[PDB]
Amino acid sequence: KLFITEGYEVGRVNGLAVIGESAGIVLPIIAEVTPSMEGRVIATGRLQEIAREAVMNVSAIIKKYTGRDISNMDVHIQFVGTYEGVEGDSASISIATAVISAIEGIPVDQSVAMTGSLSVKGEVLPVGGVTQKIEAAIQAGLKKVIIPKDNIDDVLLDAEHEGKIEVIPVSRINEVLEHVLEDGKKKNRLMSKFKE
Amino acid sequence: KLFITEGYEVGRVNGLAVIGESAGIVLPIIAEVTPSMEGRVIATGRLQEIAREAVMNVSAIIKKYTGRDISNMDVHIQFVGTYEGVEGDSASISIATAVISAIEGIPVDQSVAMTGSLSVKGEVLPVGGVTQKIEAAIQAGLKKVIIPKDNIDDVLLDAEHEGKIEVIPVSRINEVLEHVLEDGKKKNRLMSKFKE
Amino acid sequence: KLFITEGYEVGRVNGLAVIGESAGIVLPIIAEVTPSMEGRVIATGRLQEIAREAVMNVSAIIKKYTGRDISNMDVHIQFVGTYEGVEGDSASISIATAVISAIEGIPVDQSVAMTGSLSVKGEVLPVGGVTQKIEAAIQAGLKKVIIPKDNIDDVLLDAEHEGKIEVIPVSRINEVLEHVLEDGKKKNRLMSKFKE
Amino acid sequence: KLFITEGYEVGRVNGLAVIGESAGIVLPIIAEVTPSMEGRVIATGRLQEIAREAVMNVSAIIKKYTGRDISNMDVHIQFVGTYEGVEGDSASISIATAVISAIEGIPVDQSVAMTGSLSVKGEVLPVGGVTQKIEAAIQAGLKKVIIPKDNIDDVLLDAEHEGKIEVIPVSRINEVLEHVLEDGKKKNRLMSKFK
Amino acid sequence: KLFITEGYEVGRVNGLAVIGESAGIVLPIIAEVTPSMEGRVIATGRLQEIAREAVMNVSAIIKKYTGRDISNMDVHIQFVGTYEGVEGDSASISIATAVISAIEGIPVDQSVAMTGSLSVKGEVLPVGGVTQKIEAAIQAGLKKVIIPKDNIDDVLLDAEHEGKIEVIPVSRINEVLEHVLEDGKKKNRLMSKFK
Amino acid sequence: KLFITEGYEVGRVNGLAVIGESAGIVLPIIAEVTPSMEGRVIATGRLQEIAREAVMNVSAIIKKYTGRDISNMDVHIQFVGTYEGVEGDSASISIATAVISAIEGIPVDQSVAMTGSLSVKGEVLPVGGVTQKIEAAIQAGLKKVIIPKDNIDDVLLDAEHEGKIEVIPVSRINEVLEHVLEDGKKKNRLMSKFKE
C-alpha cells in the first residue's frame, strides 16, 4: 500500500486526488524540514508545483500565528508513489498540514484523509471530485475525511456509504489541525497560537 | 459548490469561461498579495499561464491608474476547483478585479459574474462564448453579468432568460469596479483616481 | 469582432500575420507606456520576443531623431485576439508604430493595416505571407495596407480581390507614420524630427 | 551484455523503473564524487531533479551519522541506457546508495536490484510499479531485488516469476546497505556509524 | 521578393539554407550594431540560436585580428522573412560575414550567396544540402556562391547549370571577405589584419 | 564531404551514429574551447542537447586529466553537417575526445572512427547499432573503429569486411586517447596522468 490507514506519523498526511476523469486516489504526502543553514522547497515529479504553492501559502500562516519562519528551513516534500494521470488540488491542505506537522513535531492521524485548497489567509477553499475522493477514501479503509465546508452539497453518497466514513467539513486550517493532530500538550499549545 | 453567489469577499471574483466549446461555466478566482520579502505571480493547474499573463497585462492599470508596482508583491491566484477543458479569457477582467480588490482591501459582490479581456489601456474588449457564459451565470443563480460593450449584440437569450439576469455592458475597467466593489469610503477614493 | 476597422485611436495598430500555411489574420497590437515608477517591455505569449525586438529597434530610432529616450519607461505591448500557430514578423512595424503612437500620444488610422520588419536604421524590410496578409485585410473590410516596398512583386490577388484595398509600398519608418498618424500639430512637430 | 548483473563495483547500483505503464526496467545509476575548489550535483536528463533530491536526502543522512559533509564535493550522477518515457522514484534509493558507495569507496553487489524512495531521516518509502519492476529484475537475470517493506502486498507474482528471485523488504537505508555493500573493514566501520 | 540580387549593402548577406529535406532557399540576413552603453545578441524566430552562435564565433575572430570587441556592442540580427521548415547551418558564415560588415562599415556584394559553418578559429567547415543550396542560388538569379572547400565533391550540377553560376570554394573567413566585401581602402586595411 | 578521412586535427573526431533505424553514419564533431567571458557549452541544431549532456557528464574526468574546470571555459561544439533523424550516443566518447583534444592542443587521428558512452568513472559502456556504425565507417574509407569491449559480440562482419577495418574494443577512456591522439611528448605526459 502507498499509504498508511492507521496510527500516527509525523509529517505524513493522506490527501486525496482524482485520476483519469472519474476515480479518486489516496495521495499520501511526507514533509520534512532541515535547517537551511534562503530556504528551498524540494519536491519532484508531476505534483511539485502543487507542493511549492501549498508551502508558500502555509509559510505565511506559520510566520503570522507562531514563531517559526519557513524562509530559514528546507522543506522536503514527496508524494509517496508516482502520480501520472493525477490532478491534485491548488495549495492542497494535506501538504500544508504535513508541513505544519513536521515543523511542530506533532503526529498526524492517518486514519483521516482530507482535500482542500488553502488560501494564504488560512481558509479552506472548495475543490473538485469530492464524491470520487471520499469513495477512494472509503475504499482505502479510511475512517474520516476532511472536506471544505463549501463542498458539503457535492457529497453524492449512497446511504450505505454514509455510514462507512465520517465527513467533517472545515473552512479554516486550524480546524483541520484540531481534527488530525495527535492529542497532547504540543497540540494544545499550537491550537492556542491560532486564535484567529 | 466552488463559487459563492452573494455577499462581498476581498479578492474573490466569479469570472465566466467556456468548458470545451459546448457550454459556459463560472470560473471563481481568489487573488491574494503578500510583500515580496523579485515579485512573482504564483498559480498552478491548468489555467496557470493565463493567470500570470493576465496579471502581467493588468499590472499596467494596477500601478498606472493607482498605487503599487506588482514586482514589489507576490500575487497568489487560484481557480477555485479544477478546470480541464476550460478556455479562459486572455487578459481577463476577473483576474484584474480580483487583484485590484485584494490589494486595496475592498470586497467584491459575488452575485455579479463577469467576462471580458482588459486592454493595456483599460478598455474592456469583446470575448467569445458570451451567450453560453451568461446562460451558466443564470443556471448558477448569479444575479448580474458584466460583459464587453462589444458583445452586446452577441447576447441571444430567450424571453424567459432575459428577465432572469441583468446584463451590464462595460467599456472600461473603472465601470467594472464601480459595478462590483463594495460601497464605501475606500471605493470612493479609488474611483476618484480612475480619472481622467 | 474584437478589434477596429475605421476611426483613430492612440497606440493601437492593425498589424497582419499568417496562422501558418496561408491563413492571414488581422493582429491588433495595443501599446501603453508609463514611467518605470531601469524600464522593461512587458509582453506575454509566443510573440513576446518580437515585441521586445520591435521595441529595441524603435528606441534606437526615436532616441536618434527626437532625442526622446525610451529607457526610463515601461512599454506594455498586447496582442489582441485568441490565436495559436501565429508566425509573426521580426521587429514587426505594427509594434513599433504602436509604441511611437503611444509615446507621442498621436492617434492611428484604424482603417489601415500594415506588415513589415524594422531595421535599427529604420528601414522597412520585406516579410512572408504578403498575399495572405492583404487578403485578411480585405476580408476584415480595411481600406489601406502598408507593405514593405520590396514585397511589391509577391502581391498576387485574383479577381475577387484586386481593386478592393489601397495597397501602400514603403521603404522607411517615416513613410509608414506619414500614412497612419492623425494630422495636426504633433504629427507635424514629430515628422520634421525625422529629417531635422 | 549492456549493464552489469554479476560481482562488485564502486558507485554503481542496479535501480528499477518503469517505462510508464506495465513495463518495468533495470536502470543502472553510476555515481562519482570529487572534492570541490561550494560543490554541486551534476546530473543530466529528465530525471536530474530526482538525482538532486536523492543526493540532498543522503547528505543529511551522512552528516548526521558519519559526519562526512557532502557540500565540499561534486557528485556526478549518470543514468545508464537509452530509456525514454521512464517514470522515476522520488529520492530514489539506487541513487543515494550509489553516492554512498562512491563517497566511502565501497563496492556494490550487482546481483541486486532495488527500488524505494528515501526520506531525510533514512526511511525507505513504497513506490509504484512494484510487480513490474520485480519482473524486470527477473527478465534481466538478477538474484535479489530490494523492495520497500510497505510494498510487500503489491507483490503479485504468478507461476512463471514465483520462486525466481529473492525479494528483500526493507524499511531503512542501513538495511539496504547491509544487503548490497561488499563485506569487510569499511562496511563494518560504516555500519556502526549509523545505528 | 525577400533578398537583393545586385549591388552592395552594409550588413546584408545572401545566405543559403534548405527547406523540407531538399529544396533550397536563399536566406538573407541583416546585422546591425549599436554601442551597448554587456552586449547582447538580439535575434528572434526559428534561426536565432544559429545567429547567437555565428556571433559568438566571429567575436573571438574579430578580437584576435582587429582588436575591436563585440562584448561592448549590441548585435541585432534578422532573417529577412520567416523560415519555418528550415535548417540553418551551425555557426553560419553568412551571419558572421554580415556582422564583420556592420562593424567595419564595408558593403557586402549582394550578387554572391554563401554557405558554410564558421569555427571559432576562422575555418569554413562543410555543410549539408549544397547542391539544393546552389540550385536555389541559380533559381534566384545569383551570380556566385561561396561554399566550403570540403563540399566540392558534393556540387552535383548538369552541364547547363555549371555555366550559370560561379562556385567559389573557401576554407577560411578571410577568403569569404576578400570575395564579398566591396573594394576600397577599408577592405585593403581589413585584409592586411587577417594575415 | 562532411568529415576528414586522414591526417590529424585538434578537436576533431569522427564519431559514429544511427540514421533513423536503417543504417550507421559518420558523425564528425569539432570542439573548441575559449576562456569564459561562468562557462557554457554552446551547440545548436538537432543534437545540441546530447553535446551538452556529453560535456556535462565528462567534466569530472575532463578536470582530473587536464585540471581545467569546464565552468572556467566556454566549449563550442559543432557536428559538421545537419543530422535530422540521428541518434547520438549519450555520454559520447567522441565528444569527450574532441573536448580533451581541444583543451590539450593535441591532434586526433581522423582515420579512426569511434562509438561508445563514457561512464562518469571513465569506463566505456556499450552502445546500440555497432555493425551498422562500423559499416558506415567501412563505406566512409575509415581505417579503424574503436568500440566498447562489451559490443565485441555485436560486431557481425560479414567478411571481406573484416579485412577492411580494424575493430579496436576498449573499456576505458585512456585507451581511446592512446589509440587516437597524435604521438609526441604532449600525449606521453597526458597518458602518464591516467592512474591512481
PDB file of N, CA and C in Angstrom, chain F residues 91-153:
ATOM      1  N   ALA F  91      26.666  10.500 -23.500  1.00  0.00           N
ATOM      2  CA  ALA F  91      27.955  10.385 -22.859  1.00  0.00           C
ATOM      3  C   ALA F  91      28.984  10.009 -23.897  1.00  0.00           C
ATOM      4  N   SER F  92      28.889  10.606 -25.116  1.00  0.00           N
ATOM      5  CA  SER F  92      29.694  10.159 -26.285  1.00  0.00           C
ATOM      6  C   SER F  92      31.222  10.302 -25.990  1.00  0.00           C
ATOM      7  N   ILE F  93      31.909   9.166 -26.105  1.00  0.00           N
ATOM      8  CA  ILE F  93      33.384   9.204 -26.220  1.00  0.00           C
ATOM      9  C   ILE F  93      33.958  10.124 -27.277  1.00  0.00           C
ATOM     10  N   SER F  94      33.354  10.237 -28.424  1.00  0.00           N
ATOM     11  CA  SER F  94      33.946  11.107 -29.437  1.00  0.00           C
ATOM     12  C   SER F  94      33.845  12.566 -29.009  1.00  0.00           C
ATOM     13  N   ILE F  95      32.774  12.958 -28.320  1.00  0.00           N
ATOM     14  CA  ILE F  95      32.649  14.288 -27.786  1.00  0.00           C
ATOM     15  C   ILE F  95      33.617  14.511 -26.613  1.00  0.00           C
ATOM     16  N   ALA F  96      33.746  13.563 -25.706  1.00  0.00           N
ATOM     17  CA  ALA F  96      34.803  13.717 -24.757  1.00  0.00           C
ATOM     18  C   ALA F  96      36.201  13.869 -25.353  1.00  0.00           C
ATOM     19  N   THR F  97      36.544  13.074 -26.350  1.00  0.00           N
ATOM     20  CA  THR F  97      37.883  13.092 -27.006  1.00  0.00           C
ATOM     21  C   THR F  97      38.117  14.416 -27.705  1.00  0.00           C
ATOM     22  N   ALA F  98      37.133  14.916 -28.503  1.00  0.00           N
ATOM     23  CA  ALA F  98      37.191  16.264 -29.102  1.00  0.00           C
ATOM     24  C   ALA F  98      37.483  17.292 -27.991  1.00  0.00           C
ATOM     25  N   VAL F  99      36.797  17.222 -26.808  1.00  0.00           N
ATOM     26  CA  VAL F  99      36.915  18.248 -25.880  1.00  0.00           C
ATOM     27  C   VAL F  99      38.350  18.213 -25.346  1.00  0.00           C
ATOM     28  N   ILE F 100      38.761  16.982 -24.977  1.00  0.00           N
ATOM     29  CA  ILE F 100      40.009  16.748 -24.256  1.00  0.00           C
ATOM     30  C   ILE F 100      41.080  17.154 -25.252  1.00  0.00           C
ATOM     31  N   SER F 101      40.959  16.626 -26.437  1.00  0.00           N
ATOM     32  CA  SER F 101      41.801  17.131 -27.545  1.00  0.00           C
ATOM     33  C   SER F 101      41.904  18.630 -27.641  1.00  0.00           C
ATOM     34  N   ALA F 102      40.799  19.381 -27.663  1.00  0.00           N
ATOM     35  CA  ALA F 102      40.834  20.815 -27.948  1.00  0.00           C
ATOM     36  C   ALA F 102      41.662  21.501 -26.873  1.00  0.00           C
ATOM     37  N   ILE F 103      41.433  21.083 -25.632  1.00  0.00           N
ATOM     38  CA  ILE F 103      41.994  21.661 -24.427  1.00  0.00           C
ATOM     39  C   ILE F 103      43.486  21.444 -24.257  1.00  0.00           C
ATOM     40  N   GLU F 104      43.997  20.241 -24.665  1.00  0.00           N
ATOM     41  CA  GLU F 104      45.413  19.937 -24.580  1.00  0.00           C
ATOM     42  C   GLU F 104      46.204  20.424 -25.831  1.00  0.00           C
ATOM     43  N   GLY F 105      45.572  20.925 -26.850  1.00  0.00           N
ATOM     44  CA  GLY F 105      46.215  21.195 -28.131  1.00  0.00           C
ATOM     45  C   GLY F 105      46.713  19.903 -28.807  1.00  0.00           C
ATOM     46  N   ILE F 106      46.038  18.746 -28.665  1.00  0.00           N
ATOM     47  CA  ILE F 106      46.725  17.535 -29.167  1.00  0.00           C
ATOM     48  C   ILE F 106      45.881  16.977 -30.257  1.00  0.00           C
ATOM     49  N   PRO F 107      46.420  16.835 -31.476  1.00  0.00           N
ATOM     50  CA  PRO F 107      45.538  16.389 -32.595  1.00  0.00           C
ATOM     51  C   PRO F 107      45.039  14.883 -32.571  1.00  0.00           C
ATOM     52  N   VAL F 108      43.928  14.624 -33.279  1.00  0.00           N
ATOM     53  CA  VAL F 108      43.273  13.293 -33.210  1.00  0.00           C
ATOM     54  C   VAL F 108      43.406  12.764 -34.590  1.00  0.00           C
ATOM     55  N   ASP F 109      43.641  11.475 -34.704  1.00  0.00           N
ATOM     56  CA  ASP F 109      43.741  10.800 -35.973  1.00  0.00           C
ATOM     57  C   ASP F 109      42.382  10.745 -36.554  1.00  0.00           C
ATOM     58  N   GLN F 110      42.221  11.262 -37.782  1.00  0.00           N
ATOM     59  CA  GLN F 110      40.842  11.253 -38.453  1.00  0.00           C
ATOM     60  C   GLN F 110      40.477   9.964 -39.120  1.00  0.00           C
ATOM     61  N   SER F 111      41.472   9.080 -39.243  1.00  0.00           N
ATOM     62  CA  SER F 111      41.346   7.806 -39.891  1.00  0.00           C
ATOM     63  C   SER F 111      40.690   6.785 -38.945  1.00  0.00           C
ATOM     64  N   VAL F 112      40.551   7.161 -37.655  1.00  0.00           N
ATOM     65  CA  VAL F 112      39.959   6.338 -36.634  1.00  0.00           C
ATOM     66  C   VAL F 112      38.559   6.955 -36.222  1.00  0.00           C
ATOM     67  N   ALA F 113      37.480   6.226 -36.596  1.00  0.00           N
ATOM     68  CA  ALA F 113      36.087   6.358 -36.055  1.00  0.00           C
ATOM     69  C   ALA F 113      35.905   5.733 -34.653  1.00  0.00           C
ATOM     70  N   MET F 114      34.965   6.262 -33.881  1.00  0.00           N
ATOM     71  CA  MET F 114      34.658   5.704 -32.547  1.00  0.00           C
ATOM     72  C   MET F 114      33.159   5.871 -32.188  1.00  0.00           C
ATOM     73  N   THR F 115      32.743   4.933 -31.384  1.00  0.00           N
ATOM     74  CA  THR F 115      31.436   4.895 -30.761  1.00  0.00           C
ATOM     75  C   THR F 115      31.502   4.237 -29.346  1.00  0.00           C
ATOM     76  N   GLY F 116      30.565   4.611 -28.477  1.00  0.00           N
ATOM     77  CA  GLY F 116      30.785   4.491 -27.044  1.00  0.00           C
ATOM     78  C   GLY F 116      30.243   5.588 -26.147  1.00  0.00           C
ATOM     79  N   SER F 117      29.802   5.146 -24.983  1.00  0.00           N
ATOM     80  CA  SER F 117      29.383   6.108 -23.984  1.00  0.00           C
ATOM     81  C   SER F 117      30.364   6.043 -22.804  1.00  0.00           C
ATOM     82  N   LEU F 118      30.526   7.182 -22.237  1.00  0.00           N
ATOM     83  CA  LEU F 118      31.515   7.407 -21.253  1.00  0.00           C
ATOM     84  C   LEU F 118      30.794   7.400 -19.898  1.00  0.00           C
ATOM     85  N   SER F 119      31.187   6.444 -19.085  1.00  0.00           N
ATOM     86  CA  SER F 119      30.809   6.421 -17.702  1.00  0.00           C
ATOM     87  C   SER F 119      31.485   7.588 -17.005  1.00  0.00           C
ATOM     88  N   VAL F 120      30.753   8.149 -16.010  1.00  0.00           N
ATOM     89  CA  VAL F 120      31.340   9.197 -15.128  1.00  0.00           C
ATOM     90  C   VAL F 120      32.662   8.736 -14.391  1.00  0.00           C
ATOM     91  N   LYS F 121      32.871   7.405 -14.428  1.00  0.00           N
ATOM     92  CA  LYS F 121      34.102   6.761 -13.883  1.00  0.00           C
ATOM     93  C   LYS F 121      35.191   6.371 -14.914  1.00  0.00           C
ATOM     94  N   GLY F 122      34.967   6.795 -16.167  1.00  0.00           N
ATOM     95  CA  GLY F 122      35.966   6.754 -17.298  1.00  0.00           C
ATOM     96  C   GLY F 122      35.958   5.469 -18.060  1.00  0.00           C
ATOM     97  N   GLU F 123      35.025   4.627 -17.729  1.00  0.00           N
ATOM     98  CA  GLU F 123      34.618   3.431 -18.448  1.00  0.00           C
ATOM     99  C   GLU F 123      33.902   3.665 -19.755  1.00  0.00           C
ATOM    100  N   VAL F 124      34.163   2.780 -20.716  1.00  0.00           N
ATOM    101  CA  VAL F 124      33.446   2.772 -21.962  1.00  0.00           C
ATOM    102  C   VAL F 124      32.318   1.772 -22.051  1.00  0.00           C
ATOM    103  N   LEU F 125      31.058   2.274 -22.090  1.00  0.00           N
ATOM    104  CA  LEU F 125      29.869   1.423 -21.953  1.00  0.00           C
ATOM    105  C   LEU F 125      29.338   1.167 -23.304  1.00  0.00           C
ATOM    106  N   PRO F 126      28.627   0.024 -23.485  1.00  0.00           N
ATOM    107  CA  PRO F 126      28.098  -0.456 -24.781  1.00  0.00           C
ATOM    108  C   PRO F 126      27.023   0.464 -25.369  1.00  0.00           C
ATOM    109  N   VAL F 127      26.937   0.434 -26.695  1.00  0.00           N
ATOM    110  CA  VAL F 127      26.091   1.369 -27.407  1.00  0.00           C
ATOM    111  C   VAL F 127      25.332   0.495 -28.440  1.00  0.00           C
ATOM    112  N   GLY F 128      24.262   1.000 -29.068  1.00  0.00           N
ATOM    113  CA  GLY F 128      23.427   0.218 -29.973  1.00  0.00           C
ATOM    114  C   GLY F 128      24.043   0.504 -31.380  1.00  0.00           C
ATOM    115  N   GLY F 129      23.655  -0.299 -32.426  1.00  0.00           N
ATOM    116  CA  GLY F 129      23.988  -0.048 -33.819  1.00  0.00           C
ATOM    117  C   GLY F 129      25.430  -0.284 -34.190  1.00  0.00           C
ATOM    118  N   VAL F 130      26.166  -1.089 -33.461  1.00  0.00           N
ATOM    119  CA  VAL F 130      27.613  -1.333 -33.796  1.00  0.00           C
ATOM    120  C   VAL F 130      27.962  -1.834 -35.211  1.00  0.00           C
ATOM    121  N   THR F 131      27.193  -2.764 -35.814  1.00  0.00           N
ATOM    122  CA  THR F 131      27.667  -3.346 -37.011  1.00  0.00           C
ATOM    123  C   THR F 131      27.402  -2.287 -38.034  1.00  0.00           C
ATOM    124  N   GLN F 132      26.246  -1.603 -37.850  1.00  0.00           N
ATOM    125  CA  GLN F 132      25.744  -0.518 -38.638  1.00  0.00           C
ATOM    126  C   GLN F 132      26.714   0.609 -38.644  1.00  0.00           C
ATOM    127  N   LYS F 133      27.188   0.966 -37.459  1.00  0.00           N
ATOM    128  CA  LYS F 133      28.115   2.076 -37.382  1.00  0.00           C
ATOM    129  C   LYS F 133      29.464   1.737 -38.151  1.00  0.00           C
ATOM    130  N   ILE F 134      29.994   0.535 -37.920  1.00  0.00           N
ATOM    131  CA  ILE F 134      31.180   0.042 -38.484  1.00  0.00           C
ATOM    132  C   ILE F 134      31.102  -0.001 -39.992  1.00  0.00           C
ATOM    133  N   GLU F 135      29.988  -0.470 -40.472  1.00  0.00           N
ATOM    134  CA  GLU F 135      29.639  -0.481 -41.863  1.00  0.00           C
ATOM    135  C   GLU F 135      29.549   0.946 -42.516  1.00  0.00           C
ATOM    136  N   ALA F 136      29.103   1.967 -41.825  1.00  0.00           N
ATOM    137  CA  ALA F 136      29.265   3.325 -42.372  1.00  0.00           C
ATOM    138  C   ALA F 136      30.743   3.756 -42.366  1.00  0.00           C
ATOM    139  N   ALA F 137      31.471   3.245 -41.357  1.00  0.00           N
ATOM    140  CA  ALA F 137      32.877   3.532 -41.292  1.00  0.00           C
ATOM    141  C   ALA F 137      33.669   2.874 -42.480  1.00  0.00           C
ATOM    142  N   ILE F 138      33.370   1.650 -42.823  1.00  0.00           N
ATOM    143  CA  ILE F 138      33.928   0.979 -43.999  1.00  0.00           C
ATOM    144  C   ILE F 138      33.580   1.736 -45.266  1.00  0.00           C
ATOM    145  N   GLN F 139      32.303   2.025 -45.512  1.00  0.00           N
ATOM    146  CA  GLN F 139      31.923   2.877 -46.687  1.00  0.00           C
ATOM    147  C   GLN F 139      32.571   4.279 -46.685  1.00  0.00           C
ATOM    148  N   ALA F 140      32.597   5.026 -45.556  1.00  0.00           N
ATOM    149  CA  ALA F 140      33.435   6.212 -45.486  1.00  0.00           C
ATOM    150  C   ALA F 140      34.982   5.987 -45.810  1.00  0.00           C
ATOM    151  N   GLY F 141      35.571   4.769 -45.742  1.00  0.00           N
ATOM    152  CA  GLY F 141      37.027   4.622 -46.022  1.00  0.00           C
ATOM    153  C   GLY F 141      37.907   5.083 -44.782  1.00  0.00           C
ATOM    154  N   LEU F 142      37.295   5.057 -43.614  1.00  0.00           N
ATOM    155  CA  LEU F 142      37.997   4.973 -42.405  1.00  0.00           C
ATOM    156  C   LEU F 142      38.759   3.703 -42.126  1.00  0.00           C
ATOM    157  N   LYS F 143      39.842   3.778 -41.321  1.00  0.00           N
ATOM    158  CA  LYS F 143      40.758   2.666 -41.324  1.00  0.00           C
ATOM    159  C   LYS F 143      40.577   1.814 -40.098  1.00  0.00           C
ATOM    160  N   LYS F 144      40.132   2.398 -38.999  1.00  0.00           N
ATOM    161  CA  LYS F 144      39.900   1.671 -37.778  1.00  0.00           C
ATOM    162  C   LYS F 144      38.601   2.233 -37.181  1.00  0.00           C
ATOM    163  N   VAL F 145      38.006   1.447 -36.260  1.00  0.00           N
ATOM    164  CA  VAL F 145      36.829   1.825 -35.476  1.00  0.00           C
ATOM    165  C   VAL F 145      37.047   1.301 -34.035  1.00  0.00           C
ATOM    166  N   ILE F 146      37.003   2.214 -33.103  1.00  0.00           N
ATOM    167  CA  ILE F 146      37.121   1.891 -31.704  1.00  0.00           C
ATOM    168  C   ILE F 146      35.706   1.668 -31.246  1.00  0.00           C
ATOM    169  N   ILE F 147      35.404   0.555 -30.550  1.00  0.00           N
ATOM    170  CA  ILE F 147      34.082   0.311 -29.976  1.00  0.00           C
ATOM    171  C   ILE F 147      34.215  -0.121 -28.519  1.00  0.00           C
ATOM    172  N   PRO F 148      33.070  -0.129 -27.750  1.00  0.00           N
ATOM    173  CA  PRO F 148      33.041  -0.814 -26.466  1.00  0.00           C
ATOM    174  C   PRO F 148      33.337  -2.345 -26.530  1.00  0.00           C
ATOM    175  N   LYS F 149      34.258  -2.675 -25.620  1.00  0.00           N
ATOM    176  CA  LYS F 149      34.675  -4.033 -25.289  1.00  0.00           C
ATOM    177  C   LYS F 149      33.375  -4.856 -25.174  1.00  0.00           C
ATOM    178  N   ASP F 150      32.385  -4.307 -24.473  1.00  0.00           N
ATOM    179  CA  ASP F 150      31.089  -5.009 -24.376  1.00  0.00           C
ATOM    180  C   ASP F 150      30.192  -5.202 -25.603  1.00  0.00           C
ATOM    181  N   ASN F 151      30.507  -4.615 -26.751  1.00  0.00           N
ATOM    182  CA  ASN F 151      29.853  -4.836 -28.026  1.00  0.00           C
ATOM    183  C   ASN F 151      30.686  -5.727 -28.942  1.00  0.00           C
ATOM    184  N   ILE F 152      31.761  -6.289 -28.455  1.00  0.00           N
ATOM    185  CA  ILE F 152      32.604  -7.161 -29.196  1.00  0.00           C
ATOM    186  C   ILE F 152      31.726  -8.234 -29.868  1.00  0.00           C
ATOM    187  N   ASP F 153      30.716  -8.779 -29.208  1.00  0.00           N
ATOM    188  CA  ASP F 153      29.827  -9.819 -29.811  1.00  0.00           C
ATOM    189  C   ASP F 153      28.759  -9.417 -30.809  1.00  0.00           C
TER     190      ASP F 153
END
